[PDB]
Amino acid sequence: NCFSGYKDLIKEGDLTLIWVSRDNIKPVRMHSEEVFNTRYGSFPHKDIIGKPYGSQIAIRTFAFVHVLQPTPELWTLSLPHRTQIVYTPDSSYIMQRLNCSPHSRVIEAGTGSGSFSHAFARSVGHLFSFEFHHIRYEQALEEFKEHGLIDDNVTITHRDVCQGGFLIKKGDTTSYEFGNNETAASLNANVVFLDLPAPWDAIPHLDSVISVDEKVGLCCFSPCIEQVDKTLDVLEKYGWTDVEMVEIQGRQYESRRQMVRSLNDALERLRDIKRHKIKEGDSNYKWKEVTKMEAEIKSHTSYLTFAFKVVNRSRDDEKVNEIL
Amino acid sequence: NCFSGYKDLIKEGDLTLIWVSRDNIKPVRMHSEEVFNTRYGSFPHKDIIGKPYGSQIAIRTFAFVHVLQPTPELWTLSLPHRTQIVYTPDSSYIMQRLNCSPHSRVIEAGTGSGSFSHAFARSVGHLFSFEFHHIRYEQALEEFKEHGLIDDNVTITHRDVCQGGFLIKKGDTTSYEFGNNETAASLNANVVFLDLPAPWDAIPHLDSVISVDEKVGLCCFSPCIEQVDKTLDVLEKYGWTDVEMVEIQGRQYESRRQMVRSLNDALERLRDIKRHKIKEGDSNYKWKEVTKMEAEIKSHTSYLTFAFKVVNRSRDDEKVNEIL
Amino acid sequence: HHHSQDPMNALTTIDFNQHVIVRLPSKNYKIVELKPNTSVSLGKFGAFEVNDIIGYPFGLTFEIYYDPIGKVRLLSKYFTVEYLSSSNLLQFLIDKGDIQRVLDMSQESMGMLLNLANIQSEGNYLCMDETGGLLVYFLLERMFGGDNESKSKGKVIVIHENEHANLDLLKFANYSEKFIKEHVHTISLLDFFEPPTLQEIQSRFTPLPKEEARALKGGKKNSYYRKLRWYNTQWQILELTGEFLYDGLVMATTLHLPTLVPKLAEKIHGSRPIVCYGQFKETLLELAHTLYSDLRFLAPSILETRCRPYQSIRGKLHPLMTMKGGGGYLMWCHRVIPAP
Amino acid sequence: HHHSQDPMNALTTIDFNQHVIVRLPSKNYKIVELKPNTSVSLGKFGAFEVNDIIGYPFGLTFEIYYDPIGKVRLLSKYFTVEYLSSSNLLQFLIDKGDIQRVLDMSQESMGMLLNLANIQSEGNYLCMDETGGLLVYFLLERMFGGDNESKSKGKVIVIHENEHANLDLLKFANYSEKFIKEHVHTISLLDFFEPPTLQEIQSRFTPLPKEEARALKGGKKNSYYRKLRWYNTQWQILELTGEFLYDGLVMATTLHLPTLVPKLAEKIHGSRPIVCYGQFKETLLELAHTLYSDLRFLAPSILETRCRPYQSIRGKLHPLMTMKGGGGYLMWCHRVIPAP
Ligand SMILES: C[S@@+](CC[C@H](N)C(=O)[O-])C[C@H]1O[C@@H](n2cnc3c(N)ncnc32)[C@H](O)[C@@H]1O
């Protein structure tokens, strides 16, 4: 993955994220004969290649961009704004509550634009991702491939998980590379994230693919509270416990300044009226530091329903005896 | 109402609110031979009576209280903490969205502890309040009476509004004083607030008591979202429009200070360790002003469902012609 | 009036020469003055005849249809007509993009300000309002409900930064000029803190005995009463600035609060609320620490209220996905009198 | 080991000599060390034999019953045994009242910090942690998942205020002392900013040729290697403080950030994230304005994340009525390299 590890110098062929402004971050593949364009100027790649990652790049009549190494957080900010993706406040909370680590073996459906996928892949032992829509599947496959996710720890599979479950067998449409004598993947998932219209149709299929000897964590991502209600019903029927729904609310603040305007100065203007019978931070004036909420807030992304399961609720009795 | 108007001096017999601390406000009736007790000392009423409202009262070995004129906001803060009452963030929003004023004629059920009642009564043309529980009814009646609400603009009636509706007839258990030739109150409500377990059972009875020639506003107060769902159903059936549910979230912040601790001072301590081979705001130190959220927040009080109705959806056609 | 029949109630009913609210299908607001025998254009959504909506209650939705000015009927494109409440005026100003002009205030913050300040029909309130009068309008509507014939005697006293107050939003309010001059008094910061003395005023004018003044006519009568109105303006300032104590202080100003609020509070009675609205919490934090040192203020608190609406469709309930941030903050405290 | 059979996986399975989490019926947490042939008291809820829970998966609820130490069976009073995750350690510290010790941090704020900082198994991260090591523990668990045998080579470098680091919470972590010394390096602010020079170090000690040092025995060998460990400590400081550039900076300190973060960021590579946690937003606001002036920092942002749980019972869904306030704030930005 070009998302993984820490690169020093920008090289020809590298995928970069070019920061133009806070709301304008563009994925750009470096090529010596290409030019990057902004509403403020043109930035030739040959004047970028060879410089350190994190470089500010300047052109005269001055205009600037910053060239950054891809990261899931930054990649997520670069995706089309109104779309159906998981943002960092939700996903970072989900990964932390489900305790993600190289120990994690995760099942994600559906893949969508792969926002959560990239954050999973950075941290996790393996990611098994499922996508119902064949065009979306092919786009995600091509992109995961290009990014180096496929040759690292990510598998994607074209599947309707509500109808066909989560098994990956030789012959299925999948990126999975089967080992010697392997005719089916052994998913052995201990982490499950469902982002689907009807997660309650997918939950029954999980018993065939989750780990049987450890606590398995699940999060379902649903926009409407009647969807949460259907999920709570089916989680209970299929033996999932410690069930809790939460919401996550993220806010961002600008650092700003408000002009200090004294009473005495207002009085002095009134006295002078009687006799006759600015850019923020301007050093001619006094300023007070203040925080200002972002103009538009994401007041709802989805409800997050967490649940846990242990299949083999037992121990090896005399293996414990055989320790003495 | 001793809640209404603005008193100058504390008089014998006055109901006061004695502020002991932010979470300790006590209703105390002034009587020259009585004494008010606090975990910090005893405050004789005779040393309070005759002083201006808002007076800080001091006793030696010094301890203090402040004696305030009753107000709905303060009264609400003085009620038992865990109880089922409406707090100022919800009620002030409800009154503003329903545009409360002396023009308002309101219907409230149930009365409960009368938190919202007092805020209504301050602003509104008349308040018609209904309480199902006979002991609660008698307590609210006695208290409203004592406070002067009953002899001003408040009526309370012992009623199950879901079963018996909202009509007030001579013979009913009510505080209503019937005028000459009056055998029934004409409620003519243009504002309705329902705080009940099943507001959808009360909504059908409203058509008999609401104003018929103006926009009528309704707010239903329900803790669970399945309750909101039942309300949305019945509001639609009975012709209520512009229906919207919202939540109100209130937070309070303390003004605090955090000690400023420089790098250089930490280095200098490390240098001295090498050679050998406070109360907040303390003037010996530097401090930064900060805001600190209250330790416990009210993260949910109830869902607020608003709705509006016009009964006579018509005009006087040639009365409009008769203007030319 | 000159009609024998009872007039229409402009608080309940769409009426001639009133400023009213019109909600478009895109849900943004317009303010429309209902001049008789005129038409109103809603651009894309058509135009209609003012006369055709008079006499209806507020809250109705009208369809414009054509057999360019259309006809109207109750909706069986369209618009909804509403009373111009304090809430709807605020929303209209936000729709038209004036959010910084109103200092980022929200319906819920202003609603809470009214109750924290204990605003009542008979109170005399000290007020600073930098919004063009939106705060004064919230007060008046709560106090009087739009009723020009109200018998209540409450007043809003507005202290302001320039020579004249900016209360232009009151031009939308449907209060008469008489009502406003009886319930709203304006006075500059300078006149409020350094008022003229009686001697200073009388040495420029002392009235004629009223028998003599009554007998004046022509240009001498007009010349004199113009001087007498100046005299009464000055007299009112004396009344407002003496040992008169007010029933509450409400503020929406961007002046420096720590150096202003303590001076204003000298004229507030013991036990009365003080409420300062601020767009930025840090502003109020500085104020609260200042007031903490001053025993004339009881327990200053910074409060926040935020409304989150839901998509209120049965079978698809969830909060709105996106909405506007902001809404500001309130500093609440009470004026009190320290013990010796 | 000395058993022929495969050992138990302490990441999936309740195991001897592990520190684990116990959730009581009152839902508060305890941390319990599972020493073989010992008993554990839960006060009111009874006591049990450690041996009787070994070998089970985490996540199960056990009933204590009596025919005072009881017997245990799966719940058909009781307790639930959980892995000691970074989340559960934080919750345990909050339950026991140590909320100010952990600077009011929440699960969601720490979860976001991990991802904003792009924390990975192979990264070398600069860290300040005033919590007794809770932040270091969040990092290690994300990087290595509790796996003492992990092949990953990532490191947390902890810069600290006193002579020694306070990382006592790591005593609960079930990482071996070897693992910790290979992945956690500690260095004081003074050693980090004013490190010793090579000349200074060698003039107090230069090693013997390793053939000669190997041939040492007795007290001379012990005397020498003690000096050689001091030498290696100093050498490690040279490695950590030279022209070594780090992959990220994460901070949870109450030191003055505006005067500290720019100095620390000199050792961070271009394009790497900087995340400062703060209990108070005003602190971070001051920092953000400071960093705005410094072209080595790209677009500093103050972020907030808040979790609100629901009562998750079908037919009675609503958010929790009351809960703890706070949870703190993050300042996020990226180190960048200005153009000439
Ligand atoms: C909102 S998106 C997922 C976004 C993704 N979590 C992210 O962070 O970028 C939902 C995706 O689920 C896919 N999907 C829907 N139903 C599915 C099913 N039954 N099986 C697999 N995928 C499905 C849809 O095609 C869509 O791409």
Ligand SMILES: C[S@@+](CC[C@H](N)C(=O)[O-])C[C@H]1O[C@@H](n2cnc3c(N)ncnc32)[C@H](O)[C@@H]1O
């Ligand atoms: C939560 S309380 C109201 C609190 C009140 N809003 C306040 O702010 O203090 C609910 C009250 O409704 C009353 N109530 C319940 N069902 C009722 C009914 N059918 N008719 C009238 N009152 C009812 C209950 O006795 C209870 O006192």
